[PDB]
């Protein structure tokens, strides 16, 4: 009975996948896009305040909730 051998892919997951399923890194919104739903967005932190944000579906209605939260 001979020793058996192992071929490991290894570099299948050499590095994290490249970004865009066309998911937008940055969204500018100064005073839709279809599936950035349920994903977390944030503003730059100012004076110890976090602003988190996402868009969710209820039936056919979409709300973008923004939370203002201290740290």
């Amino acid at each position: 009975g001979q020793e058996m051998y192992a071929f490991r892919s290894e570099e299948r997951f050499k590095s994290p996948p490249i970004l865009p399923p066309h998911l937008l890194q940055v969204i500018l919104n100064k005073d839709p896009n279809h599936v950035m739903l349920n994903h977390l967005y944030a503003l730059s932190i100012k004076d110890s305040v976090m602003v988190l944000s996402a868009t969710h579906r209820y039936k056919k209605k979409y709300v973008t909730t923004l939370l203002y939260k201290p740290i």
Binding site: D47, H56, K60, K61, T64, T65
Partner: protein
């Protein structure tokens, strides 16, 4: 006149029906600084914000312009006596300073409840914002308002199965307030205006001249504009001068007469996209106000 077409429409439509396809919603954790919180309302172009309590893990209340108004009155007076607490207060600590024994539980409504239930709720609780919360998610979807609701009504009801009461005047139906009209003069200081806001719990003040004729309107929203300044000090100025710092809107300009029919008034309010009309006489002398709440109260109690 009618067991209204209005009544029937309101009973057969869900709150969900009024929600826009897309909307934004601002939420504050009750441990947020009030000064930061109100600055955020302005930044986002929003008039009201649900309040989330982290320890309890639930919505507990609402932070509106009226609150911003109560807070600023207390700040101005306290300062004159060397008490500088409030601006470093957290929403919690101020909600602890006001509510005390006087209970104010958050009132909300399901997306599946009727529009009639929604109009009843606003009227009964003497309120301008009604959060629509999904009972399955616990999510706030949208904030319902009189202005929204009236627009929806005007839009989706046919004109001509028309109740007799639509052809009757504000006088005969007795809609609006015609006594003790809270008002300011051209030269009235902003801090006096605030005082009136706090006492009469009214959302806008007509600006009058020496004969008592309407020249402008001064509003509570005109107050969250005192959140653009990173100083807060400017309070001693005349109401006129403060309305120069104005950007847009316009009201005040919106007058009506005691003898216009309900139909004409509804059309004017909805079209101009305004919150109230200043009832006036032959010579522009103010006689009363007719606001969106007046009208919704009228339509829910079947004309009258």
């Amino acid at each position: 006149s009618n067991s209204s077409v209005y009544t029937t429409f309101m009973k057969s439509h869900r709150c969900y029906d009024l929600i826009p396809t897309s909307s934004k919603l601002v939420v504050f954790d009750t441990s947020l600084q009030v000064k930061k919180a109100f600055f955020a309302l302005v930044t986002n172009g929003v008039r009201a914000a649900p309040l989330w309590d982290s320890k309890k893990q639930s919505f507990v209340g609402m932070l509106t312009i009226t609150d911003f108004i109560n807070i600023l009155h207390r700040y101005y007076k306290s300062a004159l006596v060397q008490i500088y607490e409030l601006e470093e207060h957290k929403i919690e600590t101020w909600r602890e300073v006001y509510l005390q024994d006087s209970f104010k539980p958050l009132v909300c409504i399901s997306p599946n409840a009727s529009l009639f239930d929604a109009v009843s709720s606003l009227i009964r609780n003497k309120i301008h914002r009604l959060p629509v919360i999904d009972p399955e998610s616990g999510n706030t979807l949208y904030i319902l308002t009189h202005k929204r609701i009236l627009k929806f009504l005007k839009l989706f009801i046919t004109e001509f199965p028309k109740p007799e009461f639509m052809s009757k005047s504000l006088e005969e139906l007795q809609i609006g307030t015609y006594a003790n009209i809270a008002m300011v003069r051209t030269t009235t200081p902003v801090y006096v205006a605030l005082g009136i806001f706090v006492q009469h719990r009214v959302s806008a003040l007509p600006v009058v001249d020496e004969k008592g004729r309407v020249v402008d309107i001064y509003s509570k929203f005109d107050v969250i504009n005192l959140a653009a300044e990173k100083t807060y000090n400017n309070l001693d100025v005349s109401v006129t001068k403060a309305l120069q710092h104005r950007s847009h809107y316009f009201e005040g300009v919106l007058k009506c007469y005691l003898h216009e029919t309900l139909e004409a008034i509804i059309n004017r309010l909805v079209e101009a996209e305004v919150h109230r009309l200043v009832v006036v006489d032959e010579h522009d002398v103010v006689k009363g106000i007719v606001s969106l709440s007046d009208i919704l109260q009228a339509l829910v109690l079947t004309g009258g």
